Design a protein around this ligand. Structure first.
Ligand SMILES: [Zn+2]
Lengths: 188, 11
């Protein structure tokens, strides 16, 4: 069901990746035949191995196949972090990044050297660093040291910020997200 | 770039 939907995104996005210069998997996905993510991963791993043997372990094709398997495993990792984020990241309706998740992502000002503080969602964390996804164009990811993090509740004018155009859009997207959160406006 | 976001390059 939802699994079939997520696997369709992965297969599609990996075919787009495959243009780095399998129907069986495509069929098994399209027909919703997979009953596990590890099962899907094993098939991708099998496909990788048959490919590396088919062309040679140092062929251009083997270089691409390893990259494709890596990216696929990355997709499955991301899917586990938050399946709502994963869905919205693929479907991408208008203001897709503004819709809240359950549980809600912690919102922080994240500082990278040279960029000043930028608003972001927390995807996961450990004691010394936080994996964040920034608001604004491109919606990129970065591991941020714990000491470069401030909770979203502090006023922005008290933080080192560089007010580029992209920064303003990011803050506008942040405010729209906070509104959707208060509204209880979930994506349907 | 992955749909869930690529790594933001250091300044
Ligand atoms: Zn999420």
């Amino acid at each position: 069901q939802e699994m079939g939907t997520y696997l369709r995104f992965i297969v599609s996005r990996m075919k787009e990746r495959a243009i780095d210069l399998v129907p069986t998997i495509q069929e098994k996905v399209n027909e919703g035949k997979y009953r596990s993510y590890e099962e899907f991963k094993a098939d991708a791993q099998l496909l990788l191995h048959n490919t590396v043997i088919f062309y040679g372990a140092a062929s251009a094709q083997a270089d691409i196949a390893r990259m494709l398997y890596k990216d696929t495993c990355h997709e499955l990792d991301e899917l586990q972090l938050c399946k709502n984020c994963f869905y919205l990241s693929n479907a991408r309706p208008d203001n897709w990044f503004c819709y809240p998740c359950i549980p809600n992502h912690e919102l922080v000002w994240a500082k990278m050297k040279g960029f000043g503080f930028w608003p972001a969602k927390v995807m996961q964390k450990e004691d010394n660093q936080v994996d964040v996804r920034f608001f604004g164009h491109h919606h990129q990811r970065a591991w941020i040291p714990s000491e470069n993090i401030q909770d979203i509740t502090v006023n922005v004018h008290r933080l080192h910020v560089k007010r580029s155009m992209g920064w303003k859009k990011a803050c506008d997207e942040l405010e729209l997200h906070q509104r959707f959160l208060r509204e209880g406006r979930f994506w349907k | 770039a992955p749909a869930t976001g690529g790594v933001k390059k250091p300044h």
